[PDB]
Structure formats: structure tokens, C-alpha cells
Enzyme design. Structure first.
Site, PDB file in Angstrom:
ATOM      1  N   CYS A   1      20.431  73.599  34.281  1.00 35.24           N
ATOM      2  CA  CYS A   1      20.398  73.924  35.703  1.00 35.24           C
ATOM      3  C   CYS A   1      21.764  74.376  36.207  1.00 35.24           C
ATOM      4  O   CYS A   1      21.844  75.163  37.156  1.00 35.24           O
ATOM      5  CB  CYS A   1      19.893  72.728  36.513  1.00 35.24           C
ATOM      6  SG  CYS A   1      20.353  71.112  35.854  1.00 35.24           S
TER       7      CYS A   1
ATOM      8  N   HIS B   1      22.344  67.044  39.222  1.00 40.34           N
ATOM      9  CA  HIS B   1      21.464  68.204  39.213  1.00 40.34           C
ATOM     10  C   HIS B   1      22.112  69.346  39.982  1.00 40.34           C
ATOM     11  O   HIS B   1      22.753  69.127  41.015  1.00 40.34           O
ATOM     12  CB  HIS B   1      20.100  67.856  39.825  1.00 40.34           C
ATOM     13  CG  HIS B   1      19.087  68.953  39.719  1.00 40.34           C
ATOM     14  ND1 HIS B   1      18.531  69.342  38.519  1.00 40.34           N
ATOM     15  CD2 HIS B   1      18.519  69.737  40.667  1.00 40.34           C
ATOM     16  CE1 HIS B   1      17.670  70.321  38.731  1.00 40.34           C
ATOM     17  NE2 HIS B   1      17.644  70.579  40.026  1.00 40.34           N
TER      18      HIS B   1
END
Ligand SMILES: [Zn+2]
Lengths: 330, 76
Positions: free
Chosen positions: A14, A282
Site C-alpha cells: 500500500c 496503512h
């Protein structure tokens, strides 16, 4: 088209998808790929390397010819970036700005076109000497020039050096909220070099207390601001979750210039976010579409609309600014 | 051919390093750990858009006197 394609997570990638979408929405870098201007800049003959640029451009071309809700796999691009930068071999989470520095380094390398003077002219000459070694269409977007003034408190001589830069890593000026302007003022604040940080003054021929000060001699067309969201506590890296209040429009950096000249106002177009803990966090991206000016959230394979009032959050890690035009006459 | 270079720490203040152009990057990272207490494998040093890599020297990056290296860590 609309460029609202998602990017498949290949395993803690990510961070990569976040940067890829920020670059995908860097207008002039995207048009460089879509119009295939990179073909004229790739190297030929012996010892040429082109696969990283070719796979990056094909990915950008795939993103901007896809339909809405399409998910693109950047697995072939990852093969090339990890060939160039072995840090990204495998499937561990990485830092987005470390990835940005290695990726832009590889892209620029494969398209590279490879005292007695006042401060302004010495800066111009040091810039020309840099362009004798680094000059590409990608460098024409990101590269600025830092000026560092080091004044010895004993003899008063101001030693000046000019370091090019592709981004600025700003300290968090920590305190509930901190403005981006505050972080820039701390970066450009006068630094008293004393104690065991006393540098050698060649004029005085010894270590002297000196005052160091940063200023910006050349402003890039694309200014990438990297917020130093970390503290160090007993060998353990600790993320700084302090909310930094950065503006979406009219970021005025004229006060940080070496010479008071006005062409230095920026507007935000992309943000790379890191949410969660220092490890196991994240990455996402908020990107303004060049064609429509609408903001979107890019979270790996999912792309959703967002209001401009949702872009500014405490998760902002890298800010992407584009230089605005000077004031119009009348 | 000793020279003084600067490292912009996490707080914005600079530390001063006494170095040779032939000094390795791990040599530079060893000196930064002595002053900042950050292990070398956690340090990332940026100069002119490049991240300094271990097996190389300062001269490989064209780092001259009173240049500034920018120290950053990792968000993962
Ligand atoms: Zn002096």
C-alpha cells in the site's frame, strides 16, 4: 479518461500504491507518460536500461485508459522497481518517501540527458554544474536548490553552499496543532552551532561558533514536503501523530526565499497518508484529479470520491504541491 | 582533506561531522548514532534527492564541505 483506477495490494504494498497514485496525479509527469515523451529520452546503445521507465509509463497509461471501478495490478512494475532498488524485493511494508526517492531516482536515471561572485550568480553557476550531471524532464519538475548560509561569529564571514533537493523533510514544530508554515519556519530558523557542533572556519583556522540558516534559492514546479513524523526513544522509532495544519490553496513561501522574489506560491494536489502504528500501519492517498479538480481517496483497490474538506488529516505524511502562476497583470 | 558536513536531525537542529571525502556511509552513520542514538539500520540520509547507501563513500555522492544531509526514519 478519469484515472480513477484502483491498484491491487501485492502484499504490504500500500506504500507503493499510495506513491504511484500521487505520481499518477502529478499532471506533467502523467502527461510525460501518456504522450510517450519518454521514448525520445530513453538511452540506446550499450549499457542502456529502460525497463523501469517503460513499466512505470505503461502503468500510468493503464490507469488513465481504464473504466471506473477498475483494479490494476502493478506487479510487473514492482518487478522492475525491486530490480533497481533491492530494498523493495519481497512483501514487507516500506516507507513511502524512501520508495519515492528510489523510484524517482531510477526513472530520472533512465531518462537523464547524461569566492569572488555574488550570492545569486554563485547559486546560478552551482546550478549549472549540477545540470552537467543531472538533467531530465523529471528533474525539471521536482528539483529545487537550497541555500545554506554559515556565518562565523568570530570573523563574520558568511560561507554559502547550494544543495539541490528533490523534496524537503520538515521537522514537526512541536501543542495540539502545528501549522505547515511553522514547520517551514523551524526548518529555516537560524541554527546556533556551538559546543561540540562548532564547525571549522577556514578563515579563522579553527573551530568557531557559527550560525547556520536555510533558504530556498530555486523553487521547483512540484514541491514535495515530507513530514518527519518520528521521535527516537531507546533505539525504538516512535511515530509522531501530531496534527499538522497544511493549507489546500495559496501556500505562500516567499518569506523562505534567498531573494525576495514572488514566484513562490503553491497549491495542494496530492497527499500520501500513513495511519496506524509505526509498524503495521496503512498507507492511502488523497489525489486531486488534474482534469476535473475533484479529490478522491485511493486506498489500494478502492477509489471513492471525497470532499476537499476531508483531505487535511493528521495522517498526512507526504504533501505534494504544484507551483502556481505569478499574479496576472490587471 | 578533512571537511565539516552537517546532518539535519529529527528536530531541525544540525550536528557537525568531521569527515573525509573517502569516508563510507556506514562510517557517517556510526558517528550519527554516537550523537543521536539512532542505530545505523534505522537511519536514512538524503542528499540532493538521493538516499545514501551503505557500501559507498561521501565522494560517490559529490558531498562537499558544509553540505547538509537530511536524517529521516521509517513509517511502516
Ligand atoms: Zn571565522
Amino acid at each position: 479518461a478519469q484515472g480513477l483506477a484502483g491498484l491491487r495490494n501485492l502484499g504490504n504494498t500500500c506504500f507503493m500504491n499510495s506513491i504511484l497514485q500521487c505520481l499518477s496525479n502529478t499532471r506533467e509527469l502523467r502527461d510525460y507518460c501518456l504522450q510517450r515523451l519518454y521514448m525520445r529520452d530513453l538511452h540506446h546503445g550499450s549499457n542502456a536500461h529502460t525497463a523501469l521507465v517503460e513499466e512505470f509509463a505503461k502503468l500510468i497509461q493503464t490507469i488513465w485508459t481504464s473504466s471506473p471501478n477498475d483494479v490494476v495490478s502493478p506487479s510487473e512494475f514492482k518487478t522492475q522497481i525491486q530490480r533497481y532498488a533491492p530494498r523493495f524485493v519481497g512483501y514487507n511494508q516500506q516507507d513511502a518517501q524512501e520508495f519515492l526517492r528510489f523510484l524517482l531516482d531510477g526513472l530520472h536515471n533512465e531518462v537523464n540527458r547524461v569566492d569572488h561572485l555574488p550570492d545569486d550568480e554563485k547559486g546560478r553557476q552551482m546550478w549549472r554544474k549540477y545540470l552537467e550531471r543531472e538533467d531530465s524532464r523529471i528533474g525539471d519538475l521536482f528539483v529545487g536548490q537550497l541555500k545554506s548560509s554559515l556565518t562565523c561569529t568570530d570573523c563574520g564571514y558568511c560561507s554559502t553552499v547550494f544543495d539541490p533537493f528533490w523534496d524537503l523533510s520538515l521537522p514537526i514544530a512541536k501543542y495540539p496543532e502545528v501549522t505547515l508554515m511553522d514547520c517551514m519556519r523551524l526548518f529555516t530558523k537560524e541554527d546556533v552551532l556551538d559546543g561540540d557542533e562548532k564547525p571549522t572556519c577556514c578563515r579563522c583556522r579553527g573551530r568557531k561558533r557559527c550560525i547556520k540558516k536555510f533558504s530556498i534559492q530555486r523553487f521547483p514546479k512540484i514541491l514535495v514536503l515530507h513530514l518527519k513524523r518520528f521521535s527516537e526513544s531507546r533505539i525504538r522509532t516512535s511515530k509522531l501523530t501530531t496534527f499538522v495544519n497544511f493549507p489546500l490553496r495559496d501556500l505562500d513561501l516567499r518569506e523562505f526565499a534567498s531573494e525576495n522574489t514572488n514566484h513562490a506560491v503553491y497549491n495542494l494536489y496530492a497527499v500520501s497518508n500513513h495511519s496506524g502504528t509505526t509498524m503495521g500501519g496503512h498507507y492511502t492517498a488523497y489525489c486531486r484529479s488534474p482534469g476535473t479538480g475533484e479529490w478522491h481517496t485511493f486506498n489500494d483497490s478502492s477509489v471513492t470520491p471525497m470532499s476537499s474538506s476531508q483531505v487535511r488529516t493528521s495522517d498526512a505524511y507526504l504533501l505534494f504541491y504544484e507551483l502556481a502562476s505569478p499574479p496576472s497583470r490587471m | 582533506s578533512t571537511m565539516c558536513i552537517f546532518v539535519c536531525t529529527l528536530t531541525g537542529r544540525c550536528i557537525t561531522l568531521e569527515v573525509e571525502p573517502s569516508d563510507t556511509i556506514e562510517n557517517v552513520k556510526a558517528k550519527i548514532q554516537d550523537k543521536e542514538g539512532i542505530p545505523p539500520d534505522q537511519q536514512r540520509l538524503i542528499f540532493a534527492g538521493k538516499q545514501l547507501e551503505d557500501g559507498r563513500t561521501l565522494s560517490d555522492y559529490n558531498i562537499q564541505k558544509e553540505s547538509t544531509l537530511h536524517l529521516v526514519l521509517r513509517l511502516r
